[PDB]
Amino acid sequence: QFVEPSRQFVKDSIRLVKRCTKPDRKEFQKIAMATAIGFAIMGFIGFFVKLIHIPINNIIV
Template identity: 70%
Template sequence: MSDVNTLVFQPLQQFFKNSVHLVKKCNKPDRKEFARIAGATSVGFLMMGFIGFFVKLVHIPINNILVGGGGA
């Protein structure tokens, strides 16, 4: 039982102790910090969306040229 205690229970106990300590030490962002983080995330999403849109916009004509539209 001593081996089980040292191999299983003590590391788990230490992990939970460290986790509780971390949660107690953390604090919520204030309104200004939250707005800054939300704005930066929004700008990132918009930039990725525009990059994807322009890549798709360039890819469609190139794909039609390579595959050949086969039209008139």
């Protein structure tokens, strides 16, 4: 008796995605720029810290 619950779940999920408010070009561009900026900040700050500290850890150790 698993087929019917799975079918009902698939139907409900499909309906929900039909109703969901998907992003448009403007919203997707805004979120993409924000995510790129956050990734750049965190990742590049970490990369520069690691790059600075590799010679330093080589010296002190």
